[PDB]
Design a protein around this ligand. Structure first.
Ligand code: MG
Lengths: 85, 115, 156, 93, 71, 116, 148, 59
């Protein structure tokens, strides 16, 4: 029943992101945390790369817009400056 | 013959009804696409295969973030029948360096900096 | 809007009425209190638990053995707590998580009894009239865990 | 009741019929793609604004590719590797 | 015969299912040749004849006499 | 005969040991045994998909039986448990149906309640 | 294949985890050659790793023979009587180390197909299902169509 | 629960007798019910090889 999960905003597959997969499967009886699971580490690395790409793309697009604005400003100011006589 | 298909521009001109239906504001449009491949490139032309490879959508159901800029949009228009596109929503803005490792892409299309 | 009673006038399934929320909450509190009192008084024998370990859900009870199809990075004889317990049940009551029960409720503990390799599994690829034949033998790592105890607490 | 020839290829084929399930599947795909059209109808930058905004990064990436391509060269050879082969006759005295 | 109840926080569902005994009134007092052989056995056990015919030495020797036992 | 194979006995035995439980000459004659042993190994490999497919079908059948004992249909049970956020899988549900009938009764009542 | 191979059920030796964990490996016997490239790795293992393993596993008696027969070997004897013999021919030090640790962590039970990934001696707590669970009873236990 | 092994197994795998009244009933629906019961697909302990079918008496 993945459509209902999607409507509620969860992952369509309960094996996706969620408590059942992202929480540690076990811990030492003393209480010491278990070493991170391999799948969780891989998934964290993938999410970090995804976030880094999001940041990079957003920054590149913003820088491009700012550079275009500066180019328009330079063009207009220079064409105005040509009026000197 | 079978050829590339030229999509008329009127197809990609949203109407107010579409704006209400999908919840996107034409002013201040979203910056990034989340594109997932939901369809095989098999039995599709080699040019669609190549576009998918370029966009990095070889794996199905693996979201990929792309710029919402005209060239990327041209490629996405070529392969629009194989992909699902949703805007990337940033309720807390783009992640900071501190929490770059604590993000998660919710199925709604939101990148939350807490997980 | 009254429709005369016909075969198709009303849906075949019996009509259902939502109970009044006040009485629903009262009944809920009564049941929860009763079960909590049973837990406090220890009115239960064996407990079983559905626990999500590795990638699968295991129906488990004290003294049970579980074969995980991978090495766990634990020394044999080492005691562990299984933290994703989906269900805990007794003879007269069961507690269901949504989807996971709280740590305060249930404590499922196991012990690494064995670390082994599975029997050799054969992977054979063959295609007729193509001279295509490939053979591989794979042994999977395994860990046998013994479930030592399942404890519940009156934290409802 | 047989279909002449081989099914699904010839002039006379098995009649294929569209189930409600098939219709629903196609409609689902169509709805997804209508949403794709909407989301592709609102570019963030104009073509002129995007012109050159990624040139630096693209150039650096191709510089990395060129460096990897032109750094191909045989690996070093160490006296230790050669001499370690004498250990095949190491024994206990 | 089950009582369902969310906890106050709504994060755990509690099911109360006691075992219901059978009423005494719902109980009764305790009362106080090869071909024909196979037909009789088939009729007795509501099976077909084929089950009851013997099998060859090959099948019998294939059968495992020390099968693993669980629990 | 400068070089002659001396291990052919053992090379043959490696195959034949896997055919010893076959019928007929397939368990004795290498020419026949090798073909059948390859087929046996290919079937063994391909059967790992069918094992998982059949277990789920078996679990679904058992869950259907157990739920019908309580007036539910399997789709209703599964969907309503999902909607109530119980993520028990079909293997566990079948195990409960067999060995914890009162717990399964509770789950069926929960599913019907959610449905209503 | 499974049909051409013996199978057993998941089990421990003496309920190995209930009260306490007892290491089932009890004896290791390394037959190693003084001379011979086949046992070079075994010699390095005896020199550099056998002592640390021995002090890590005080319950395992380790013998080193320095006089093998037909190949350098390690024979592992477990409490349940099982004897597993593994050739350490032409194995490196790390390979021998991993093999020995596997023998240490492993039980004496046969490495054959295990029918079930689990083993409960008490599979049911609420009572194993039988056809009459969930079946309502009737007044005076009258079967259907019974006159009285 | 608390049964001995053999009695427990006997109870679990016992075959039950069901009665269907066919008066004014569609033979197909009768047959669906009867086939489920005969196969034993109405039992959670069902398995194709367990011979867990039941008796059906249609009148
Ligand atoms: Mg034909």
């Amino acid at each position: 029943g993945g459509q209902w999960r999607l409507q509620q905003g969860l992952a369509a597959n309960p094996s996706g992101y969620g408590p059942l997969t992202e929480l540690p499967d076990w811990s030492y009886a003393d209480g010491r945390p278990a070493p991170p699971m391999k799948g969780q580490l891989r998934r964290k690395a993938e999410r970090e790369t995804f976030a880094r790409r999001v940041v990079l793309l957003s920054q590149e697009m913003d820088a491009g817009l700012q550079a275009w604005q500066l180019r328009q400003q330079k063009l207009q100011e220079e064409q105005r400056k040509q009026e000197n006589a | 013959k079978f050829t590339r298909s030229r999509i008329p521009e009127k197809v990609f001109q949203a109407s107010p009804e579409d704006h209400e239906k999908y919840g996107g504001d034409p002013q201040n449009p979203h910056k990034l696409h989340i594109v997932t491949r939901i369809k095989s490139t098999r039995r599709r032309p080699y040019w669609e295969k190549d576009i998918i490879k370029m966009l990095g959508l070889e794996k199905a159901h693996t979201p990929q973030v792309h710029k919402n800029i005209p060239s990327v949009n041209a490629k996405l228009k070529v392969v629009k029948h194989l992909i699902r596109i949703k805007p990337l929503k940033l309720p807390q803005g783009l992640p900071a360096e501190e929490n770059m490792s604590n993000t998660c892409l919710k199925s709604t299309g939101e990148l939350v900096v807490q997980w | 809007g009254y429709v005369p009673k016909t075969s198709l006038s009303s849906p075949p399934w019996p009509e259902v009425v939502l109970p009044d929320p006040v009485e629903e909450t009262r009944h809920h509190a009564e049941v929860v209190k009763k079960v909590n009192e049973m837990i406090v008084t220890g009115q239960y024998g064996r407990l079983f638990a559905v626990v999500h370990f590795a990638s699968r859900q295991w129906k488990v009870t004290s003294e049970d053995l579980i074969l995980i199809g991978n090495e766990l990075d634990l020394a044999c004889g080492e005691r562990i707590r299984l933290e994703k317990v989906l269900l805990v049940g007794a003879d007269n009551f069961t507690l269901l998580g949504k989807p996971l029960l709280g740590k305060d409720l249930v404590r499922v503990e196991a012990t690494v009894i064995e670390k082994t390799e599975s029997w050799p599994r054969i992977i054979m690829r063959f295609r007729k009239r193509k001279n295509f034949k490939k053979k591989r033998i794979v042994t999977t790592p395994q860990t046998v865990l013994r479930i030592n105890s399942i404890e519940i607490a009156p934290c409802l | 009741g047989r279909i002449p020839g081989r099914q699904w290829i010839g002039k006379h084929r098995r009649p294929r019929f569209v189930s409600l399930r098939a219709k629903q599947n196609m409609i689902r795909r169509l709805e997804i793609e209508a949403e794709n059209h909407y989301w592709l109808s609102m570019p963030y930058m104009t073509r002129e604004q995007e012109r050159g905004h990624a040139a630096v990064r693209r150039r650096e990436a191709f510089e990395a590719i060129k460096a990897a391509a032109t750094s191909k060269f045989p690996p070093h050879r160490f006296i230790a590797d050669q001499l370690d082969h004498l250990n095949v006759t190491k024994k206990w005295s | 015969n089950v009582e369902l109840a969310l906890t106050s926080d709504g994060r755990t569902i509690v099911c109360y299912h006691p075992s219901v005994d059978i009423p005494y009134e719902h109980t009764k007092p305790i009362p106080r040749e090869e071909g024909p052989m196979i037909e009789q056995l088939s009729k007795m056990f509501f099976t077909t004849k084929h089950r009851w015919y013997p099998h060859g030495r090959y099948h019998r020797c294939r059968k495992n006499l020390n099968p693993p036992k669980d629990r | 005969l400068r070089n002659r194979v001396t291990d052919r006995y053992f090379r043959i035995q490696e195959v034949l040991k896997h055919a010893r439980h076959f019928r007929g000459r397939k368990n004795r004659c290498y020419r026949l045994a090798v073909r059948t042993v390859i087929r046996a190994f290919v079937k063994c490999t391909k059967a790992r998909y069918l094992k998982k497919k059949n277990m789920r079908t078996l679990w679904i059948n058992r869950i259907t039986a157990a739920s019908q004992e309580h007036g539910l249909k399997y789709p209703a049970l599964i969907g309503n448990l999902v909607k109530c956020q119980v993520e028990l899988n079909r293997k566990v549900l079948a195990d409960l149906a067999i060995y914890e009938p009162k717990t399964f009764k509770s789950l069926a009542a929960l599913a019907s309640r959610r449905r209503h | 294949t499974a049909r051409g191979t013996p199978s057993r059920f998941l089990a421990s030796v003496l309920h190995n985890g209930l009260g306490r964990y007892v290491q089932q490996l009890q004896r290791l016997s390394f037959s190693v050659s003084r001379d011979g490239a086949s046992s070079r790795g075994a010699r390095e293992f005896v020199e550099r790793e056998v002592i640390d393993f021995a002090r890590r596993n005080p319950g395992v008696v380790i013998y080193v023979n320095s006089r093998p027969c037909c190949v350098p070997r390690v024979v592992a004897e477990y409490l349940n009587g099982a004897v597993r013999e593994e050739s350490i021919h032409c194995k490196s030090v790390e390979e021998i180390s991993t093999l020995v640790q596997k023998l240490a962590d492993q039980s004496g039970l046969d490495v054959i197909r295990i029918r079930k990934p689990f083993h409960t001696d008490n599979p049911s707590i609420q009572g194993q299902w039988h056809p009459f669970t969930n079946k309502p009873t009737t007044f005076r236990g009258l079967r259907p169509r019974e006159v009285q | 629960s608390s049964f001995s092994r053999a009695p427990q197994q006997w109870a679990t795998f016992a075959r039950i007798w069901y009665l269907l009244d066919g008066k004014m009933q569609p033979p197909g629906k009768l047959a669906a019910m009867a086939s489920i019961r005969l196969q034993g697909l109405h039992k959670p302990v069902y398995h194709a090889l367990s011979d867990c079918g039941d008796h059906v008496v249609i009148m």
